[PDB]
Amino acid sequence: SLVEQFVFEALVIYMESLALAHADEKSLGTIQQCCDAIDHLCRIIEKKHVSLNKAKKRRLPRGFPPSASLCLLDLVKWLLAHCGRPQTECRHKSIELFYKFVPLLPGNRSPNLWLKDVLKEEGVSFLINTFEGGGCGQPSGILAQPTSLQATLCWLDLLLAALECYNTFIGERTVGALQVLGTEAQSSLLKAVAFFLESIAMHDIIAAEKCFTSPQEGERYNYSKCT
């Protein structure tokens, strides 16, 4: 009864806990603890899902501020909207698990055609929902170059999350690269290429923003650049 009542809230709560752990310090092992926790969660819900497959009015989680009868598809589209997140490896685990949950839908597996049916409404919103990266979609990265080292790290790992999303999408072979390349006007990759022109392997110390070595402790900046 309680798992029918209280799981999806626990799922979302543990995923922002993991997001917070990514935000503060990814070196600590809390990531693996919550990862195995959500592993237990996904295993138990994939064992028993038909009750969750229907729309049963459950307690509203933190997400989905409108109230409705809780369904599996509800948190499906919830996690779909909750991609493109700065916590790039938290997001990576979330999207891998999501790609595993998509076939768990009763009448639908996860072929490319199902994603195309989903995408039929998302002619161009796909460029922002999955790619909030690139400078808040785009403009922040343009603004990032003039204007703050932590902000540069934020934009950098945002680009990392966006490109990881791209890698996951193309790796599943469920979507072509030309579906986003050329079809819809995206310049995040072009801005990244300009960033490699201006920053990668010569600007290892300065971001050319003129607003900011061990006194700066830019070593984690260097490691993020290498990443």
What CA–CA distance (Å, rounded) separates 213 from 206? 10
Which two tokens mark 103? 């076939």
| Specified resolution (Å) | 4.2
| The residue type at 77 | K
CA dist 188 and 162 (Å) reads 9
Query: Tokens 């490896």 belong to which residue?
Result: 89
Residue 149: is it exposed, middle or buried by C-beta count within 10 angstroms (0-12/13-18/19+)?
A: middle
Residues 6+ apart with CB under 8 A from 173: 112
Task: Report how this structure was experimentally obtained.
Answer: cryo-EM
Task: Count Cα atoms within 13 angstroms, Cβ side, for 213.
Answer: 3
Q: Alpha-carbon distance 42 to 40, whole Å? A: 6
Question: Hey, what's the torsion of the CAs at 33, 170, 77, 151, to 10 degrees?
Answer: 60
Least Cα distance to 168 among 97, 81, 72, 86 occurs for 97
Two structure tokens written together for 87: 């916590």
Select from 189, 184, 191, 177 the least CA-distant residue to 127: 184
Task: List C-alpha distances in Å: 60 to 10, 64, 68, 128.
Answer: 11, 7, 8, 26
